[PDB]
Amino acid sequence: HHWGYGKHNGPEHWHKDFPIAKGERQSPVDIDTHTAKYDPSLKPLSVSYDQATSLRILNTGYLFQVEFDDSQDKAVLKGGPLDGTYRLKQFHFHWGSLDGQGSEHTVDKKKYAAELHLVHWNTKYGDYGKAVQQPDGLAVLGIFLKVGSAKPGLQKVVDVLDSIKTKGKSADFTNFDPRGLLPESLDYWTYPGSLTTPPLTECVTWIVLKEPISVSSEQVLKFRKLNFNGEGEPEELMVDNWRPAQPLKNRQIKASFK
């Protein structure tokens, strides 16, 4: 009886194994665009993915993730609200059973069909496992997906998903360029928060881009053919793997723009 997304082990139950679920800096949150404050001291984000080295794609039983070689300073995120350098470790998505839900963050209560998270860890902490013990250990870049035109840079990901249908499957996934997943603008909101899955650690500086990317109905329908179950177990489609918005509490969301 591990955690997951269902009636019996979903977000409303996680607090019993992970009491920080009721903490003061939980994610995701609703971004109220009217109350987010423009902060002229923020910088433009620096997204430097030119040397990114993807290695593998994995169905974790909760989502799928594309992992990178983060044993050297290749693909990094800096600037914006961040102090120092954050190295890209992996990206993953959360998505819905229907095009009207699936994102973790919301914008003026709007839900998007999915949300991409690019997870980076602060190199001052030496590796990821140390970084997630720190209040400024991770920086997660969040990008909304809406359904419309296909995203060409997503198709390599979509087409390998049939090889990782079930929990614990991986496949080689080299030479994938995550720049193809980024919208035109790097305008963003930022706030201090948490992992959105157990253990829900409060170690994340969230940077959520305002501009969603467009993906096609067929691309997101291929996400929904993944399975939460292992091979040889009853089929449970991997859909609705998002945590709802959590209370903002004593936090301010800052805007990098207008």
Ligand X SMILES: NS(=O)(=O)c1c(F)c(F)c(S(=O)(=O)CCO)c(F)c1F
- Tell me the C-alpha distance between 201 and 23, whole Å: 9
Binding map of Zn ion across residues 98-117, x = CB under 5 A, - = no contact: -------------------x
Asked if residue 59 lies in contact with residue 98, where contact means CB atoms within 8 angstroms, the answer is no
Backbone torsions φ then ψ of 132, nearest 5 degrees? -75, 0
26 binds ligand X (CB under 6 A): no
Minimum separation from the CB atom of position 79 to Na ion (A): 25
The site that binds ligand X (CB under 6 A) totals a number of residues, namely 10
Q: Smallest distance from the beta carbon of 232 to ligand X, in angstroms?
A: 25
Binding residues for Zn ion, rule CB under 5 A, total 1
* Residue 8 in marked binding region: no
Instruction: Name residues whose C-beta falls within 8 Å of residue 153's C-beta, 6 or more positions apart in sequence.
Output: 177, 179, 180, 181
- CA torsion angle 247 251 256 258 (round to 10): 80
Q: Cα–Cα distance between 130 and 152 in angstroms, integer? A: 36
Shortest distance in whole angstroms from residue 242 CB to Zn ion: 8
Distance CA 85, CA 175 (A): 23
Q: Which does 58 bind (CB under 5 to 8 A by kind): ligand X, Zn ion, Na ion, none?
A: none
Using CB under 6 A as the binding rule, whether residue 195 contacts ligand X is answered as: yes
Told to check if 25 binds Zn ion by CB under 5 A, we report no
**Stretches 39-47, 106-114, 163-171, 189-197: which one binds ligand X (CB under 6 A)?**
189-197
* CA distance linking residue 116 with residue 28, whole number of Å: 13
Q: Who contacts 156 (Cβ-Cβ below 8 Å, separation ≥6)?
A: 176
Residue 71 interacts with which of ligand X, Na ion, Zn ion, none, CB < 5 to 8 Å by class: Na ion
One character per residue 108-147, x = contact with ligand X (rule: CB under 6 A): ---------x-x------------x-------x-------
Is-contact 95 237, C-beta < 8 A? no
User: Is 2 marked as binding a ligand?
Assistant: no
Annotated binding site for substrate: 196-197
List contacts with ligand X (CB under 6 A).
Answer: 89-90, 117, 119, 132, 140, 195-197, 204
Annotated binding site for Zn(2+): 92, 94, 117
